[PDB]
Amino acid sequence: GDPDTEIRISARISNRINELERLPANLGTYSLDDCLEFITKDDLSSRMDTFKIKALVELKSLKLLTKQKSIRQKLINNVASQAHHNIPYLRDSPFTAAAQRSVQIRSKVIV
Amino acid sequence: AEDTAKLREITKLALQLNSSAQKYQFFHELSLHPRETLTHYLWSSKQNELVLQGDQYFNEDAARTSDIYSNNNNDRSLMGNISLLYSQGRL
Amino acid sequence: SLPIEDNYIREVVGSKLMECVNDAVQTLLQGDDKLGKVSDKSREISEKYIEESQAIIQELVKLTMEKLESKFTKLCDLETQLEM
């Protein structure tokens, strides 16, 4: 809660999104392990893209945030929404068993 | 009227009488046979502690973080329902 | 199970007594020699509530009577009115 310190979180994520979205698309690595492959004038080394994938996993994981929030809501509001049929130490207490037993009472037939 | 408050006071006082009588009867039944009431205490206090500690992982900032889903196979309670909940179409 | 905003949460936002009591009771349920040392020690405490309970009961026997008195003073009204 406390939407004073909720905006101060949601203004640091826009920082990171508008800092990652100003990187050049022609970004590439040069590791110290391409010397063992003997790359010619035109040979297409196989470790050129170990930073541009990492600079898109962050940029697309920081846009799929309010999708995993909506999946976590559907998870928690269907695991905690039962809470008395799966957890063993709650469906064995006196009061929970008495309440579940007492909701199932069929109404009395007059005559 | 004053009669309502007077009857309310008599009701409150009878409830205090019930409280004192139950606190008597506990120590009397512990005085007669103490073994199978101390075993009852050690069982039921543990069970009620587990019942009160059945709700601590459903807070605001305990669910917005990641220390429920990842690495909590020690807990095992949720993230094991996902084989069931997808098969029911809820998602 | 992806920590996506966990780092920003850690940026912006940076008992024993009853367990010892339970160990004491688990030691009391081993040797018989303490059980009588419990029992009479409990048996006086029950008496401590009996001296409680009558001090409640002798209050109700007070607090009923005025209400009963509040029903005599109305009924002696009718001792006139019906005879009227």
């Binding site: 800092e19 990187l23 930073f51 600079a55 962050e58 | 990641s66 690495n71 | 920590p3 966990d6 780092n7």
Partner: peptide, 26 residues
């Protein structure tokens, strides 16, 4: 323990902004 990786090599410097790599500089 699982942690989101602190990708420092992508991160542009804040205080100086003249000691970055030449690709992250404009």
């Amino acid at each position: 323990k699982k942690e989101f990786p602190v990708n420092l090599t992508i991160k542009k410097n804040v205080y100086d902004s003249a000691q970055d790599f030449n690709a992250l500089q404009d």
